[PDB]
Amino acid sequence: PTLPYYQPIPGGLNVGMSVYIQGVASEHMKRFFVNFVVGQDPGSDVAFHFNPRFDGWDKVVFNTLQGGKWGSEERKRSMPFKKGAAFELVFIVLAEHYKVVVNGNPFYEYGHRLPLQMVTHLQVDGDLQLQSINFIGG
């Protein structure tokens, strides 16, 4: 797949589903993001925004965009990615939260703010190369 990636999730998002992303973080990475998006119209809500950042104290930001407004940011001050390194990024969709697993290590649990069944698309962009995106357990 090529970037930017913005594709429908087959059968929409459901509990039990996993999203498995294999990529390589850019040698020159500042940020990238993975968005679980409600539709493909301009100004679509983002149920879940997953945003690793190397600017400043290395961290990952988690948020929701609803009605044009970013919510209260959640943050984990730990960077499971590495500039120039291949990664395995898994989102396990559970009833209570998205469980994020990076290179086999449980990383974060992001509680649902928008109903997960409203999600139609996965969007991925930023400072990385994409090797594959797979939807499992749909």
Residue numbers in the entry: 15 to 152
What does the paper say about this structure?
The tandem-repeat galectins, of which galectin-4 is a member, contain two distinct CRDs at their N- and C-termini, connected by a variable-length linker region that is susceptible to proteolytic degradation. The overall fold of human galectin-4N is the conserved galectin β-sandwich fold comprising two β-sheets, F1–F5 and S1–S6, of which the concave side of the β-sandwich (S1–S6) contains the saccharide-binding site. As with other galectin CRDs, the amino acids forming the binding sub-sites C and D are conserved, while those that construct the A, B and E sub-sites are slightly different, granting galectin-4N its unique binding specificity. To investigate the interaction between human galectin-4N and its natural saccharide ligands, we have determined the crystal structures of human galectin-4N in complex with glycerol (the cryoprotectant), lactose, lactose-3′-sulfate (3′SuL), and 2′-fucosyllactose (2′FL) at 1.70–2.00 Å resolution.
The cryo-protectant glycerol was able to soak into the binding site of the apo-crystal. The oxygen atoms of the glycerol molecule are found in positions that mimic galactose O4′, O5′ and O6′ and interact with the conserved residues His63, Asn65, Arg67, Asn77 and Glu87. The carbon atoms of the glycerol molecule mimic the cyclic ring of galactose and make a van der Waals interaction with Trp84. In addition to the glycerol molecule, a water molecule is found in interaction distance of Arg67 and Glu87 residues and mimics the conserved interaction observed between lactose C3 hydroxyl and these two protein residues. In our human galectin-4N-glycerol complex structure, the binding site of galectin-4N is pre-organised to interact with saccharides. Due to the weak electron density and the lack of proper coordination, we have assigned water molecules at these positions for the galectin-4N-glycerol, galectin-4N-3′SuL and galectin-4N-2′FL complex structures, despite the high concentration of Na+ ions in the crystallisation condition.
